[PDB]
Design a protein around this ligand. Structure first.
Ligand SMILES: Nc1ncnc2c1ncn2[C@@H]1O[C@H](COP(=O)(O)O)[C@@H](O)[C@H]1O
Ligand code: NA
Lengths: 394, 383
């Protein structure tokens, strides 16, 4: 399987002064094609290094897609670099220059001399029309290979790319991907439960991505092999998979509440409101979520019903259950979730950072789960939120 | 000027399933040093290609920094690829294994076989300790060059990187950045070494950057020109400004929130030491909850109003007995409410001398309006 190389041009992309979403979007557009994307580059606006990267990319690939640096400034050097990389000279296309002149004239302005540059193409390039911008793109076919220059701005390049992509004659491959979202199982256990199902092959592959909301397992590749291998994987992880594709834990909790005709409330310590924030992120939350309290001080804990006998061990399963039952009674909700524990950086009640209890109380009783989360303060906070949400969708 | 090469490892990065901020962040951290950054890479999780890219980056660079693929799975292959690229074998280090085992034991777990691979290193490598996981990093000093392997999650590598970066012995250059954080004034009106303005949910930042001498002089004159609009600098956040006021006065704080849903309480408590002043809050997300915690009946049908914001602030302050109390109410989106558009927001502060309310009309989607609402509330106390 041959390579596609993707290069976003622009010094600002290197430093994140412009966020490079171009190279990823292009990469995702290549999914239906039997090409391998091994890497993406972001390259500075400098002719020699850029020329070097293009030549190398071209030498190893069936397709090279470049984005950006097609402006009129001295910092816009992509055309020169491609020219240098492929050993062809730039040529003024008088006709294109007229269209560039027209662009400015339509806006009541003479064409700046700088913009003359934008009507240069090498002999191997045909033009790609940009009715949205001054810079027309290129399509270079050479050596049985394709190279495509696109302007930076997405609204300029997206229609251009959509048009030319099916014209390149890239080989197709029926492609699928499956995303499984788990909770409460770490990477190593997934490894063990999967064993040989954790495939890494040219036709299909299985990857894991640990998030604050749990480990995502993605199977991707040939449609046939993805379908059956992802179903096997789902079987092995059945009780820990709470969602697929776009599903979020918040949205999952919402579906359950709506299915049941049930309501929810919360009582939070260490997460400080972040669980309510996350529940209320999804439009339509007011249909089930009655509200909540943040019991950050000892006095607030007492005020909202934590028993006095537990105020010296608020970081406990006992307190967590009491908090959840208290919220349920206080809000009159069908369900209630509680969070208590040690965010970091310091210990609390002699317990170390990451020590977290989450609880759910409902019509048939209450239940508690204990966690020792690694990570800094903000990480521990976030995991606690998802841990609490996970009690409802297990 | 020698090169710095920077690779983020992760197939999910190529596709932007997770957006690569690591390589950019590391690049910015390198500005005070006399190294050239010509390109950055994202590489798929595959040993052969990854080893090729590492071999090539190391050949051409004074410094190579890799971020990602130090988990225990068959899709974590950065250690193997670096070992391949540098021609060295992976060797299990008994001591680090003992630490990994202890890490799991404290969590009440037996150490899984798979994690053993994480205590593996090449002879030329030194460990960079990871008090935040079981994957510690590497620092290879070899032929006068440096290669640093870092874990992927920023909460994890940042402290490792902050710590190792001065130890690398890179040549310095006098570069600096000063960030001035304003509230309640647009870019345009601000308009009226290099200076830039960056609109954020917490207000417009004015960044001055370039040669440290020039940066410091010019940014003091910019701070002069915007004296009354600047609420903080550098790392300062509104929540931390609020914390400094509460501490100075020995005062307390509480909140009652509707549209923000708990995000204001979240943001206040993000800052360590928040429990010295923050007593707690109510998320009054239903009419029943508003009533029960002290909002008058007469106001319950009209939530998008200055009167409601006032009453919530007062209700919270009475409920918790705090010196000050903040409230948020209004329309997050995507739907209008009470004939008011998304982004119509009232924030309130109740304190010893009474209450004040500010109305905003915020652009942005639901999450953006929530966030700006949080900062608008905090800003009542510190602007
Ligand atoms: N790799 C990229 N990803 C996302 N947006 C980009 C990229 N490169 C350029 N842009 C956008 O297009 C603009 C650059 O304009 P130009 O100088 O005409 O390429 C930037 O200001 C961004 O708005
Ligand atoms: Na109990």
């Amino acid at each position: 399987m041959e390579r596609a190389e993707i290069l976003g041009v622009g010094t600002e992309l290197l430093y994140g002064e412009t966020l490079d979403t171009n190279t990823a979007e292009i990469a995702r557009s290549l999914k239906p094609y039997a090409l391998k994307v091994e890497r993406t580059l972001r390259v500075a606006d400098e002719v020699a290094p850029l020329a070097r990267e293009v030549e190398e990319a071209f030498a190893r690939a069936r397709l090279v897609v470049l984005s950006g640096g097609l402006g009129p400034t001295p910092d816009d050097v992509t055309r020169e670099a491609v020219a240098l990389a492929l050993g062809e000279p730039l040529e003024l296309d008088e006709a294109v220059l007229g269209e560039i002149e027209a662009f400015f004239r339509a806006r009541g302005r003479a064409m700046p001399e700088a913009n003359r540059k934008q009507a240069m193409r090498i002999p191997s390039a045909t033009w790609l029309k940009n009715p949205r911008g001054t810079a027309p793109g290129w399509w270079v076919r050479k050596g049985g290979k394709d190279l495509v220059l696109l302007p930076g701005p997405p609204p300029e390049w997206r229609p251009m790319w959509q048009e030319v992509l099916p014209r390149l004659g890239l080989p197709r491959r029926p492609y699928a991907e499956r995303v499984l979202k788990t909770w409460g199982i770490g990477e190593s256990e997934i490894v063990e439960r999967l064993g040989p199902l954790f495939v890494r092959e040219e036709e299909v592959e299985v990857g894991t991505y640990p998030k604050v909301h749990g480990v995502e397992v993605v199977v991707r590749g040939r449609e046939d092999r993805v379908a059956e291998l992802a179903e096997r994987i789902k079987k092995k992880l059945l009780k820990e998979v709470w969602g697929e594709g776009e599903m979020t834990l918040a949205e999952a909790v919402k579906r359950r509440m709506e299915r049941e005709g049930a309501t929810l409330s919360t009582m939070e310590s260490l997460t400080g409101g972040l669980l309510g924030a996350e529940i209320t992120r999804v439009p339509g939350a007011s249909r089930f979520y009655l509200g909540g309290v943040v019991s950050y001080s000892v006095g607030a804990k007492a005020r909202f019903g934590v028993p006095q006998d537990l105020l010296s061990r608020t970081v406990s399963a006992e307190t967590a259950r009491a908090m959840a039952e208290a919220a349920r009674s206080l809000f009159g909700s069908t369900y209630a979730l509680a969070t208590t524990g040690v965010a970091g950086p310091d210990p609390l009640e002699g317990e170390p950072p990451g020590t977290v209890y989450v609880a759910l109380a409902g019509p048939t009783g209450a239940e508690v789960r204990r966690y020792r989360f690694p990570g800094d303060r903000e990480t521990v906070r976030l995991r606690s939120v998802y841990a609490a949400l996970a009690l409802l969708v297990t």
